[PDB]
Design a protein around this ligand. Structure first.
Ligand SMILES: [Mg+2]
Ligand SMILES: [Mg+2]
Ligand SMILES: [Mg+2]
Ligand SMILES: [Mg+2]
Ligand SMILES: [Mg+2]
Ligand SMILES: [Mg+2]
Ligand SMILES: [Mg+2]
Ligand SMILES: [Mg+2]
Ligand SMILES: [Mg+2]
Ligand SMILES: [Mg+2]
Ligand SMILES: [Mg+2]
Ligand SMILES: [Mg+2]
Ligand SMILES: [Mg+2]
Ligand SMILES: [Mg+2]
Ligand SMILES: [Mg+2]
Ligand SMILES: [Mg+2]
Ligand SMILES: [Mg+2]
Ligand SMILES: [Mg+2]
Ligand SMILES: [Mg+2]
Ligand SMILES: [Mg+2]
Ligand SMILES: [Mg+2]
Ligand SMILES: [Mg+2]
Ligand SMILES: [Mg+2]
Ligand SMILES: [Mg+2]
Ligand SMILES: [Mg+2]
Ligand SMILES: [Mg+2]
Ligand SMILES: [Mg+2]
Ligand SMILES: [Mg+2]
Ligand SMILES: [Mg+2]
Ligand SMILES: [Mg+2]
Ligand SMILES: [Mg+2]
Ligand SMILES: [Mg+2]
Ligand SMILES: [Mg+2]
Ligand SMILES: [Mg+2]
Ligand SMILES: [Mg+2]
Ligand SMILES: [Mg+2]
Ligand SMILES: [Mg+2]
Ligand SMILES: [Mg+2]
Ligand SMILES: [Mg+2]
Lengths: 144, 60, 67, 185
RNA sequence: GGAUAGUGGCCUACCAUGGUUUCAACGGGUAACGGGGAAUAAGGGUUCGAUUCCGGAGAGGGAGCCUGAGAAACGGCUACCACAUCCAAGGAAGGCAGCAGGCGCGCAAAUUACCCAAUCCUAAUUCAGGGAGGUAGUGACAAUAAAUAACGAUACAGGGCCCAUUCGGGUCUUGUAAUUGGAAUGAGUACAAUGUAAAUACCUUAACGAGGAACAAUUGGAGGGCAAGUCUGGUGCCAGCAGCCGCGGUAAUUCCAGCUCCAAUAGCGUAUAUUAAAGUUGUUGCAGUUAAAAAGCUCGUAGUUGAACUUUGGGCCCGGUUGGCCG
RNA sequence: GGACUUUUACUUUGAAAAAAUUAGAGUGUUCAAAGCAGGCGUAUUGCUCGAAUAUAUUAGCAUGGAAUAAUAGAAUAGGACG
RNA sequence: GCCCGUCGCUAGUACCGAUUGAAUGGCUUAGUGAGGCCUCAGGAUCUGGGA
């Protein structure tokens, strides 16, 4: 029969054996080991809000040549430090050190985006507003 | 990799593409009327069949 | 329009089997309006601080106006 | 602590987002029955989809099984009721057939047009949402009303509105207020 | 025996040495209250359930207990611990995981409003009370219906078609039009009546309320996957884009825009999770010579599995439910 | 009423079974998501259809089957019937 | 052509590691032990042995 039991009473062996082998599932094992909650800069949550420590100019991977504007952000609930990308042209001009920002993932299940080394997050808001809006100029950065 | 590259040039292009304003044009009907206009464009009167068909041709 | 109707055998009987808000609508009863529902509650709770009639406490607290 | 208000959605969306044939196929329908949405087609596909599922199921049961007999009969009479299922093909292997167009053909939108009374599916839309055309004395303003066979005879303008007596209407009457105020006293 | 409402190592005294475990005890984890159920649609499954109903547990943490039919009760008391308020410094007092409201926390969640009219609960009780509950406010959580326009005339242009020796337009409408034509309707505003405990909205409905300066639809995308340009201008491996493959180093189909076009549309994008796709967890149903993978070899307990044979054949009756041909 | 009975699996039919959800019947909430209403007249003293059904499985209960797969039997006869 | 490792730069992650390091939480020995309850007493006062 090659290799699994077929018997009418081999149900236990068949469950155990499955259990044992689920641990080769990358998604399954992270789910049960609680990787999210344990490592990983966000809680396991969709976004996180942090504070802008310094503005970085990350040099892009090959075959691409560019300076990818980013920010080091210290997560508020965490103190965990993180570097995040600041999407679109300009937009680095919209941030500032010690500014509050709202980080989100890069849609890649952890894992860096494209030609940006190290970076697994991107900025979504600053001082409670959102890049997008600031960029398309439908809103303005707040006083202080 | 290197991590303190220049930052001087943020927004370079967007700030130096010259503005040109949007041009006042007819208003397109919204809703069902727009599907209506799509239908007569695509199927009823038709336009060209240079071999097959095109939707956004320019200088053809 | 569709609604509902009642007709009582007497006006003595309506005025006693009708919900009182209804009698108000018609003109057969007066809206005896009162303090706010929570003004009332507050009066109830203040009143709970007192044991007995009160006027005993008026005079005793009138003595205080010497110390 | 109150019983849930129950609900459910009334449409389903295509798995393949950009299939050019399905897109032309959908648009044609929209331009035929005066729809405004791909959803007004999505909706009907979904209605059909369950009806067929029911029928597929019933078919697997033995001929003249009680449920099959009872629940099949019901579904057939419901479909014939509104003019989707022809009198001849009255036995559920054809409800197993049954197309989307068979359903779209029976909307008040279309019926209001099929016997003149509008002379364009779109004139048919505008009239309906604008409180003309009725079924009884009962005004209907929903294009998707789905005209039951035995009300088809009773699609007609409403006693209110123009077109059905009553009164001309504030946009006209406003002109007759410039007729007698310019040319008279 | 004691204790309990009462069985019982529940507790005590005497006595004995038992009880559970690879069919996984015992221990650890749980970002674990359990269930009815939810999401995902070939099927088999996978994942989720703090949360409208049932059960359980708790009232800052522990323990103790009074009353009472019922509590080991917290909008009861007592003590300790932790918080914490008032003071005349002697003292006294507090427990929102009720309703609302505030701080904090954070990606993350609404009014310090109205009423017992309904639904029902309690009391000595038709009457009182009920932040139970109902009402409205905040509210793009989800779900439903579905406005942003409809019709004619005209001006050339057509494709039709009868004729074509050859002008052509003239009727049946295909419709692109920079002058036109009157009709229609609620979005809103609002007498009134209706609604309601009173209000508000809805359903009704006087008077008002549509021509582009609106009463003016969005959100993404247009190289491939993948529906839509090799238009024009800008930048020049910079700025930026790109889930992935890839673009950008001067004619960029990809960036920044203008134009036009596509998709879904009162909605559409992004992030995170999960489900389908996944026969990449495989019971159905995987793969293991060389792609990841047969233990160096044999014995072997648990476990799974395990050749064939024992009333079969023949006879008779009984009454059912479809279906035929007749009715 | 007495006196005695090898032991199981499987399968069948049925009882016991909360509602809401689900599947689904009936009903024109103007349509629909819903809701469980509603429908007829003498609409002046009232007539009337409803508020179904299905699923609900493991285990326990109750009944029918006796294939398939187990269990037990008489060999130091301490066997069986009277 | 492909290509291996030491050595050097920038940045990131996790490991080891003196500090007999630190924090939170659950149990818990020994010692001290509030309180109410039950019980041996007590008897301000106040009745007909009892409160
Ligand atoms: Mg491994
Ligand atoms: Mg590459
Ligand atoms: Mg850094
Ligand atoms: Mg009161
Ligand atoms: Mg009192
Ligand atoms: Mg004992
Ligand atoms: Mg022992
Ligand atoms: Mg195990
Ligand atoms: Mg927990
Ligand atoms: Mg669970
Ligand atoms: Mg629960
Ligand atoms: Mg929780
Ligand atoms: Mg309790
Ligand atoms: Mg608290
Ligand atoms: Mg403790
Ligand atoms: Mg307590
Ligand atoms: Mg309580
Ligand atoms: Mg003092
Ligand atoms: Mg509160
Ligand atoms: Mg409280
Ligand atoms: Mg929210
Ligand atoms: Mg009351
Ligand atoms: Mg009285
Ligand atoms: Mg309340
Ligand atoms: Mg608008
Ligand atoms: Mg306008
Ligand atoms: Mg756009
Ligand atoms: Mg394409
Ligand atoms: Mg150029
Ligand atoms: Mg270009
Ligand atoms: Mg472009
Ligand atoms: Mg979508
Ligand atoms: Mg199988
Ligand atoms: Mg494989
Ligand atoms: Mg190999
Ligand atoms: Mg080998
Ligand atoms: Mg055998
Ligand atoms: Mg059964
Ligand atoms: Mg039921």
């Amino acid at each position: 029969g090659k290799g699994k039991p077929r018997g009418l009473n081999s149900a236990r062996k068949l469950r155990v054996h499955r259990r044992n082998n689920r641990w080769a599932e990358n998604n399954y094992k992270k789910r049960l080991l609680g990787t999210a909650f344990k490592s990983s800069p966000f809680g396991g949550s969709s976004h996180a809000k942090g504070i802008v420590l310094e503005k970085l100019g990350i040099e892009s991977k090959q075959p691409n040549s560019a300076i990818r504007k980013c920010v080091r952000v210290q997560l508020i609930k965490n103190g965990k430090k993180v570097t995040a990308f600041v999407p679109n042209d300009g937009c680095l001009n919209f941030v500032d050190e010690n500014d509050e920002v709202l980080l989100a993932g890069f849609g890649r299940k952890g894992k860096a985006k494209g030609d940006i080394p190290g970076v697994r997050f991107k900025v979504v808001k600053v001082s409670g507003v959102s890049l997008l809006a600031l960029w398309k100029e439908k809103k303005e950065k707040p006083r202080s | 990799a290197k991590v303190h590259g220049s930052l001087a040039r943020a927004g370079k292009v967007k700030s130096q593409t010259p503005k040109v304003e949007k041009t006042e044009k007819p208003k397109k009907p919204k809703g069902r009327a727009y599907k209506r206009l799509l239908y007569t464009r695509r199927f009823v009167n038709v336009t060209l069949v240079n071999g097959k068909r095109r939707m956004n041709p320019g200088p053809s | 329009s569709v609604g509902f109707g009642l007709v009582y055998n007497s006006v003595a009987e309506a005025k006693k089997f009708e919900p009182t808000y209804r009698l108000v609508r018609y003109g057969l009863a007066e809206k005896v309006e009162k303090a706010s529902r929570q003004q009332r509650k507050q009066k109830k709770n203040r009143d709970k601080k007192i044991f007995g009639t009160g006027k005993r406490l008026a005079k005793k607290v009138a003595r205080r106006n010497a110390d | 602590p109150r019983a849930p208000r129950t609900y459910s959605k009334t449409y389903s969306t295509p798995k393949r987002p950009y299939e050019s044939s399905r897109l032309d196929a959908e648009l044609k329908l929209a331009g035929e029955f005066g729809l405004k949405n791909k959803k007004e087609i999505y909706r009907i596909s979904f209605q059909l989809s369950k009806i067929r599922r029911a029928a597929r199921d019933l078919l697997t049961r033995d001929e003249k099984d009680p449920k099959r007999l009872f629940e099949g009969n019901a579904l057939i009479r419901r479909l014939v009721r509104v003019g989707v299922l022809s009198e001849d093909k009255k036995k559920l292997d054809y409800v197993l057939a049954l197309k989307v167009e068979d359903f779209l053909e029976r909307r008040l939108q279309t019926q209001v047009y099929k016997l003149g009374l509008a002379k364009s599916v779109h004139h048919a839309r505008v009239l309906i949402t604008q409180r003309h055309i009725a079924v009884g004395k009962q005004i209907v303003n929903i294009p998707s009303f789905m005209v039951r066979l035995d009300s088809e005879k009773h699609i007609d303008f409403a006693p209110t509105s123009p077109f059905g007596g009553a009164r001309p209407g504030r946009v006209a009457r406003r002109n007759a207020a410039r007729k007698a105020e310019a040319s008279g006293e």
